[PDB]
């Protein structure tokens, strides 16, 4: 009935997420000219290990922050399926990681050469300074963006974006008749607003991650281990 993609994350405790649907990251690319908490000693890695990315046996994906000596690890999964415009994306998430050092996110990525972009449905920052929120990036440099702060607590919540030719609409705990908390219109005058999302054939894939350290996470040495981000499901619906 219009379901294009999902994962309900069913499966035995300790197992890998569905390999036909997700790639588990085994590397977080280092930051160019790093300063502050982007420097290597503060920069938690991604690891394809069941210590950091696993199904819990209760129908959740777990992304877990761990520490081994003075090395820090988080987790990232990258969806192998890509969807275009006229789609509604939603994940049910519990952030058990709203603590210093941590940087969880639920977002959509386009990595096409020359027109990359990203749709950050929700990010929370453990660095004690930046407000949690939602961002649409129309370039990979962070200079063509629309952002909106929204609070994050530790309960189960559904985070949704509907992406159609008119623009992008975001909900927290969507229900019939509720307004989106953030709307980003498609471009309809100089300088021309950067906006690749209405280009023909433009598609994005889902990403879920718990990053440790980096500018958004703050000092991982101040962190608590373990911390976890739980995902009950990711669903993507089309429109007729
Ligand atoms: Ca589930």
Task: Give residue limits of the domains in the chain.
Answer: 1-240
Q: Compute, in angstroms, the gap from residue 236 CA to the centroid of ligand 1.
A: 14
Give the determination technique: X-ray
| Inter-residue contact 174 to 157 (CB < 8 Å) | no
Resolution (A): 1.7
Exposure string for 138-170, b = 16+ CB within 10 A, e = fewer: beeeeeebbeeeeebeeeebbbbbbbeeebbbb
Q: Compute, in angstroms, the gap from residue 35 CA to the centroid of ligand 1.
A: 39
Q: Compute and round to an integer the Cα radius of gyration of the chain.
A: 17
Q: Compute, in angstroms, the gap from residue 235 CA to the centroid of ligand 1.
A: 11
Cβ atoms within 10 Å, residue 84: 16
Q: Compute, in angstroms, the gap from residue 29 CA to the centroid of ligand 1.
A: 30
The answer to whether the Cα torsion of 112, 119, 203, 54 is positive or negative is: positive
CATH classification (class only), 1-240: mainly beta
Asked if the bond preceding 191 is cis, omega within 30° of 0, the reply is yes
Give kind and range of the element (H or E) at residue 169. Answer: strand 167-172
| DSSP letter, residue 173 | S
d(CA 172, CA 197): 22
Q: Compute, in angstroms, the gap from residue 57 CA to the centroid of ligand 1.
A: 9
Q: Compute, in angstroms, the gap from residue 38 CA to the centroid of ligand 1.
A: 34
Q: Compute, in angstroms, the gap from residue 232 CA to the centroid of ligand 1.
A: 4
> Residues whose CB is under 5 A from ligand 1 (ion)?
8-9, 59, 232-233
d(CA 140, CA 144): 8
């Amino acid at each position: 009935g219009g379901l294009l993609f999902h994962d309900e994350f069913d499966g035995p405790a300790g197992s890998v997420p569905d390999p036909s649907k997700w790639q588990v990251s085994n590397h977080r690319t280092p930051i160019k000219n790093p300063v502050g908490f982007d420097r290597p000693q503060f920069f938690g890695q991604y690891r394809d290990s069941r210590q950091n990315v696993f199904l819990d046996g209760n129908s959740n994906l777990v992304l877990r922050a761990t520490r081994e000596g003075n090395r820090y690890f988080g987790g990232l999964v990258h969806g192998l399926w890509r969807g275009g415009i006229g789609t509604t994306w939603e994940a049910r998430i519990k952030f058990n990681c709203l603590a210093p050092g941590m940087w969880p996110a639920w977002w959509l990525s386009n990595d096409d050469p020359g027109r990359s972009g990203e749709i950050d449905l929700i990010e929370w920052y453990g660095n004690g300074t930046w407000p949690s929120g939602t961002t649409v990036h129309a370039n990979p440099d962070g200079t063509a963006f629309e952002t909106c702060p929204i609070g994050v607590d530790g309960g189960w919540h559904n985070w949704r974006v509907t992406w159609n030719p008119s623009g992008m609409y975001f909900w927290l705990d969507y229900a019939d008749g509720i307004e989106p908390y953030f709307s980003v219109p498609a471009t309809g005058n100089e300088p021309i607003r950067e906006w690749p999302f209405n280009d023909p054939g433009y598609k994005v894939f889902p990403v879920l991650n718990l990053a440790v350290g980096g500018s958004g996470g703050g000092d991982p040495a101040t962190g608590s281990y373990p911390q976890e981000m739980l995902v009950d499901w990711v669903r993507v619906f089309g429109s007729h």
